[PDB]
């Protein structure tokens, strides 16, 4: 039974994710505040991303209890903890989007900027969570009390498509635009420097004063060509000789943990459109919604782990933070 596996697996799983996630994200928060001192824009969004994960993490103890026991915290706590879940969820992905845009603007193309964009982003994360705070309530579901969603059909179609737009389409569109643009800057023609004076031949500019059109490859220039500054030949020319990894991994790992759930709710909501309206398929999609939600819920403890492995400079700060 899916409910029996839930009551055995979730309480310890969610308690471990809560603990590991709380230590991990609370280390990031106080590393950024004390050591980095929130001077850069990337530090301001990583702080807000850590806060998003913490707002999500603090709900796990109540979900851990509800896996094995009924909902004993009442209707207000059901709505409060649903709000914190969604504010943490939307805040998390929106702060990953701003980090990917910040790297795009820095490569391809300031505290007041960070504070304004962060507070506006928290506002959109709070707004996106209102529907779930409205329709989620503590209700008698047969023999047991459950804190769950009671969306009218119209709202269920809205919730599902709006969750897939903000959680899957928007971040994937931002990734394809930002990283194709970032990759395009890393694709360039080779520039060569004169080993005598130091004149750098830039293929983009070329050398139109001595018969080289802008955009000519150094190898396509004739042997008679000479250095414009000192006059030496083509034979004396040598060829001219990190945050993206962390910010890229953070978005990729987000998709891995949350896309299965987003697609399962899309399939379970519009079953007639996908052709999954039969009896056997609805039961599998209900079990899949429960299984894929657990995967997504373990994501809130992963960003501090990515920083330790992908970030070498972050690794050094974690060792200093644990010592203090
Ligand atoms: C009140 O709603 C919350 C805020 O608003 C968004 C939805 C969210 N739903 C909550 C989040 C906690 C929740 C859960 O995590 N579930 C369901 C039951 C379940 N049963 C078996 C397995 C299994 F098999 F994989 F182990 C997994 C699961 C996953 C439950 C413990 C109370 C449902
Ligand atoms: C999310 C933020 C706040 C939710 C607060 C609780 C909403 C009102 C609950 C009323 C009730 O107890 O029936
Ligand atoms: C979680 C999926 C649903 C997302 C809802 C997005 C809609 C945001 C707009 C308004 C919601 C209410 C806030 C009004 C201020
Ligand atoms: C910085 C924190 C900002 C928090 C703003 C939270 C705004 C939304 C909170 C609560 C909505 C109240 C309605 C919930 C009760 C059910 C409503 C109903 O169906 O009658
Ligand atoms: C605030 C969000 C209001 C819009 C949601 C109403 C239900 C729409 C629908 O039937 O698709
Ligand atoms: C799985 C996700 C892939 C994340 C990208 C790979 C990690 C960054 C590269 C590196 O290890 O230096
Ligand atoms: C690498 C980034 C993407 C993350 C993985 C995405 C692939 C998994 C997506 C959806 C799995 C859906 C499984 C649901 C069961 C099939 C439907 C049915 O019950 O008939
Ligand atoms: C994604 C793009 C195209 C898929 C088209 C699938 C058509 C399904 C028809 C279902 C129906 O008629 O109920
Ligand atoms: C790291 C995460 C990679 C994602 C894997 C997708 C897992 C999908 C699980 C679907 C379970 C459906 C079911 O209930 O049988
Ligand atoms: C930190 C990475 C964590 C990765 C694991 C998290 C996701 C685990 C979720 C669910 C475990 C599978 C439960 C399957 C229930 C099957 C129901 C049934 O057939 O009766
Ligand atoms: C570790 C993998 C975590 C991701 C998904 C949980 C595994 C998928 C469900 C297990 C099979 C369920 C079944 O027996 O039908
Ligand atoms: Zn020269």
PDB file of N, CA and C and ligand atoms in Angstrom, residues 1-3 5-6 9-10 13 17 257 287 290-296 298-299 301-302 305, ligand 10:
ATOM      1  N   UNK A   1       0.840  -1.197   0.000  1.00  0.00           N
ATOM      2  CA  UNK A   1       0.000   0.000   0.000  1.00  0.00           C
ATOM      3  C   UNK A   1       0.880   1.255   0.000  1.00  0.00           C
ATOM      4  N   UNK A   2       0.473   2.296  -0.755  1.00  0.00           N
ATOM      5  CA  UNK A   2       1.215   3.567  -0.826  1.00  0.00           C
ATOM      6  C   UNK A   2       1.172   4.328   0.510  1.00  0.00           C
ATOM      7  N   UNK A   3       0.031   4.279   1.220  1.00  0.00           N
ATOM      8  CA  UNK A   3      -0.154   4.939   2.520  1.00  0.00           C
ATOM      9  C   UNK A   3       0.720   4.304   3.614  1.00  0.00           C
ATOM     10  N   UNK A   5       3.650   2.667   3.082  1.00  0.00           N
ATOM     11  CA  UNK A   5       5.042   3.020   2.765  1.00  0.00           C
ATOM     12  C   UNK A   5       5.290   4.468   3.224  1.00  0.00           C
ATOM     13  N   UNK A   6       4.286   5.331   3.053  1.00  0.00           N
ATOM     14  CA  UNK A   6       4.335   6.725   3.470  1.00  0.00           C
ATOM     15  C   UNK A   6       4.548   6.907   4.960  1.00  0.00           C
ATOM     16  N   UNK A   9       8.323   5.448   5.651  1.00  0.00           N
ATOM     17  CA  UNK A   9       9.423   6.161   4.980  1.00  0.00           C
ATOM     18  C   UNK A   9       9.518   7.659   5.251  1.00  0.00           C
ATOM     19  N   UNK A  10       8.392   8.385   5.172  1.00  0.00           N
ATOM     20  CA  UNK A  10       8.398   9.850   5.261  1.00  0.00           C
ATOM     21  C   UNK A  10       8.848  10.417   6.611  1.00  0.00           C
ATOM     22  N   UNK A  13      12.680  10.199   6.683  1.00  0.00           N
ATOM     23  CA  UNK A  13      13.217  10.900   5.509  1.00  0.00           C
ATOM     24  C   UNK A  13      13.099  12.413   5.684  1.00  0.00           C
ATOM     25  N   UNK A  17      16.082  15.263   6.099  1.00  0.00           N
ATOM     26  CA  UNK A  17      16.116  16.401   5.169  1.00  0.00           C
ATOM     27  C   UNK A  17      15.983  17.703   5.961  1.00  0.00           C
ATOM     28  N   UNK A 257      14.689  17.348  -9.477  1.00  0.00           N
ATOM     29  CA  UNK A 257      13.867  17.077  -8.293  1.00  0.00           C
ATOM     30  C   UNK A 257      12.386  17.463  -8.430  1.00  0.00           C
ATOM     31  N   UNK A 287      -0.766   7.720  -7.073  1.00  0.00           N
ATOM     32  CA  UNK A 287       0.422   7.194  -6.393  1.00  0.00           C
ATOM     33  C   UNK A 287       1.674   7.939  -6.857  1.00  0.00           C
ATOM     34  N   UNK A 290       2.039  11.327  -5.202  1.00  0.00           N
ATOM     35  CA  UNK A 290       2.563  11.159  -3.848  1.00  0.00           C
ATOM     36  C   UNK A 290       4.069  10.861  -3.861  1.00  0.00           C
ATOM     37  N   UNK A 291       4.523   9.947  -4.740  1.00  0.00           N
ATOM     38  CA  UNK A 291       5.944   9.584  -4.845  1.00  0.00           C
ATOM     39  C   UNK A 291       6.788  10.762  -5.360  1.00  0.00           C
ATOM     40  N   UNK A 292       6.370  11.414  -6.459  1.00  0.00           N
ATOM     41  CA  UNK A 292       7.107  12.558  -7.019  1.00  0.00           C
ATOM     42  C   UNK A 292       7.100  13.795  -6.101  1.00  0.00           C
ATOM     43  N   UNK A 293       6.074  13.960  -5.246  1.00  0.00           N
ATOM     44  CA  UNK A 293       6.053  15.062  -4.286  1.00  0.00           C
ATOM     45  C   UNK A 293       7.157  14.857  -3.241  1.00  0.00           C
ATOM     46  N   UNK A 294       7.374  13.603  -2.775  1.00  0.00           N
ATOM     47  CA  UNK A 294       8.444  13.308  -1.815  1.00  0.00           C
ATOM     48  C   UNK A 294       9.792  13.670  -2.417  1.00  0.00           C
ATOM     49  N   UNK A 295      10.039  13.321  -3.700  1.00  0.00           N
ATOM     50  CA  UNK A 295      11.297  13.674  -4.376  1.00  0.00           C
ATOM     51  C   UNK A 295      11.494  15.185  -4.331  1.00  0.00           C
ATOM     52  N   UNK A 296      10.504  15.931  -4.812  1.00  0.00           N
ATOM     53  CA  UNK A 296      10.527  17.387  -4.798  1.00  0.00           C
ATOM     54  C   UNK A 296      10.754  17.973  -3.419  1.00  0.00           C
ATOM     55  N   UNK A 298      12.438  16.700  -0.910  1.00  0.00           N
ATOM     56  CA  UNK A 298      13.816  16.499  -0.445  1.00  0.00           C
ATOM     57  C   UNK A 298      14.787  17.529  -1.065  1.00  0.00           C
ATOM     58  N   UNK A 299      14.346  18.323  -2.073  1.00  0.00           N
ATOM     59  CA  UNK A 299      15.188  19.319  -2.745  1.00  0.00           C
ATOM     60  C   UNK A 299      15.681  20.456  -1.846  1.00  0.00           C
ATOM     61  N   UNK A 301      17.136  20.660   0.888  1.00  0.00           N
ATOM     62  CA  UNK A 301      18.431  20.449   1.547  1.00  0.00           C
ATOM     63  C   UNK A 301      19.596  20.283   0.545  1.00  0.00           C
ATOM     64  N   UNK A 302      19.363  20.435  -0.780  1.00  0.00           N
ATOM     65  CA  UNK A 302      20.367  20.130  -1.802  1.00  0.00           C
ATOM     66  C   UNK A 302      21.294  21.292  -2.178  1.00  0.00           C
ATOM     67  N   UNK A 305      24.652  21.324  -0.440  1.00  0.00           N
ATOM     68  CA  UNK A 305      25.488  20.200  -0.884  1.00  0.00           C
ATOM     69  C   UNK A 305      26.162  20.548  -2.232  1.00  0.00           C
TER      70      UNK A 305
HETATM   71  C1  LIG B  10      18.462  13.488  -1.685  1.00  0.00           C
HETATM   72  C2  LIG B  10      17.849  12.640  -2.776  1.00  0.00           C
HETATM   73  C3  LIG B  10      16.647  11.848  -2.300  1.00  0.00           C
HETATM   74  C4  LIG B  10      16.072  10.905  -3.345  1.00  0.00           C
HETATM   75  C5  LIG B  10      14.923  10.043  -2.839  1.00  0.00           C
HETATM   76  C6  LIG B  10      13.645  10.817  -2.547  1.00  0.00           C
HETATM   77  C7  LIG B  10      12.399  10.267  -3.233  1.00  0.00           C
HETATM   78  C8  LIG B  10      11.873   8.957  -2.639  1.00  0.00           C
HETATM   79  C9  LIG B  10      10.382   8.799  -2.773  1.00  0.00           C
HETATM   80  C10 LIG B  10       9.674   7.681  -2.728  1.00  0.00           C
HETATM   81  C11 LIG B  10      10.175   6.275  -2.568  1.00  0.00           C
HETATM   82  C12 LIG B  10       9.389   5.260  -3.399  1.00  0.00           C
HETATM   83  C13 LIG B  10       8.015   4.881  -2.856  1.00  0.00           C
HETATM   84  C14 LIG B  10       7.195   4.063  -3.847  1.00  0.00           C
HETATM   85  C15 LIG B  10       5.770   3.744  -3.418  1.00  0.00           C
HETATM   86  C16 LIG B  10       5.119   2.667  -4.280  1.00  0.00           C
HETATM   87  C17 LIG B  10       3.672   2.365  -3.904  1.00  0.00           C
HETATM   88  C18 LIG B  10       3.239   0.955  -4.190  1.00  0.00           C
HETATM   89  O1  LIG B  10       3.543   0.362  -5.210  1.00  0.00           O
HETATM   90  O2  LIG B  10       2.513   0.425  -3.232  1.00  0.00           O
END
